[PDB]
Design a protein around this ligand. Structure first.
Ligand SMILES: C#CCOC(=O)NCc1cc(-c2sc(-c3cccnc3)nc2N2CCCCC2)[nH]n1
Ligand SMILES: C#CCOC(=O)NCc1cc(-c2sc(-c3cccnc3)nc2N2CCCCC2)[nH]n1
Lengths: 203, 203
């Protein structure tokens, strides 16, 4: 399970000491947002490096589905955050539909994050869910009204896991983000660094 | 296990009826070859569409390691062909080293292949291994001498699994291959179609 991930992180996210794994945490989440872009629902992805060296990834896609599978009793949100290798494609009712997994899965990003905050806007509502080291602190909650749809996630990588290189390199993130923007022509991808105020916009 | 894959293929490889999954079989193997390119050992990858609508992917990298883990007793070759989600990075002695999984894993390509033939050239030897529906027909065998190093694999997708679209589209494969070649500047990527003789060379 995720216990196996926390125990041998380099085997799932990549090297936890030279910065490879650390930056892969970002791309793993960005890959998911691109799926929404490819489905033609996401027009913009914004990646922000925060001063405390957490990273947020947000998109204006449909929002990860939050309602439980009417048979299995678990939402797509819960599944992809807490089940190793969970990925692929779901529908609005959290039924799993055909689609390949790709990457390692964001449940790994969650497991190796000291804190991960998930905020999902859909069906008129803001939904919130805090995880710590991959453990949900409460069930996913409705906390307000909204007209927007999309997903926002911020994660703080665990300093129990990542060593030596514990801070994100702008150039590395800007490298991957500039590539993806050229492959998906319609999708705007912004990169913001809140430490010094540098912005990039790949469209 | 791979039994779960054969049972619900669309959940692992993607849609098995509209051709998405079928072409993903190729890219899943090509992604692995690129890892060798990135490590600076592979200078060329060649993808061939065969007349019977099997596809081969070959590279001139180091060759997948074939010797058993001195503790676990299994080679990298065996692991990545027969273990779901097996991927990442190994060393020459089949120890697993830090590295992220990415994609779904080629053991899925194997599971959904009526036949897969693996030929590995390294340490002076040609090594061969036939799989059928993911089952090894014999242990990996040494069948001759060679000075070359590299990996060759040909797979015949299972017509028990893939329906309707059972033949590969050149343009789709050429799409992905042309992209990857531009991202990895030093690596030549060829595409050959043996049905009509069309060739492409992305460098
Ligand atoms: C860290 C972390 C987690 O945050 C994220 O994974 N954020 C990236 C993301 C994922 C999605 C959506 S919206 C959606 C959907 C499907 C059907 C109907 N409506 C919405 N599905 C997804 N994903 C499902 C899992 C595989 C990637 C795509 N939007 N933004
Ligand atoms: C279908 C199918 C299977 O065929 C393939 O996966 N073919 C692609 C491939 C993979 C490799 C090698 S060589 C090597 C290596 C490592 C250390 C020392 N020497 C060689 N490692 C790999 N892979 C290990 C698994 C993840 C992708 C890279 N060469 N060509």
């Amino acid at each position: 399970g995720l216990d196996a991930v926390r125990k041998r992180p380099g085997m799932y996210i990549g090297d936890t000491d030279d910065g490879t794994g650390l930056h892969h945490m970002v791309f793993e989440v960005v890959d998911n947002a691109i799926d929404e872009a490819l489905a033609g629902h996401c027009k913009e992805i914004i990646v922000t490096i925060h001063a405390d060296n957490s990273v947020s990834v947000q998109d204006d896609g449909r929002g990860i589905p939050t309602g439980i599978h009417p048979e299995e009793g678990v939402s797509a949100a819960e599944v992809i955050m807490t089940v190793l290798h969970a990925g692929g494609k779901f529908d609005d009712n959290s039924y799993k539909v055909s689609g390949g997994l790709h990457g390692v899965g964001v449940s790994v990003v969650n497991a190796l994050s000291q804190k991960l905050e998930l905020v999902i806007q859909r069906e008129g509502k803001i939904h919130r869910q805090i995880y710590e080291h991959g453990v949900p602190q409460a069930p996913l909650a409705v906390t307000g009204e909204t007209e927007k749809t999309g997903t926002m996630v911020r994660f703080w990588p665990s300093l129990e896991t990542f060593t030596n290189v514990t801070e994100f390199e702008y150039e590395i993130l800007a490298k991957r983000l500039r590539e993806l923007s050229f492959l998906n022509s319609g999708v705007s991808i912004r990169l913001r660094d809140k430490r010094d105020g540098k912005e990039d916009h790949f469209h």
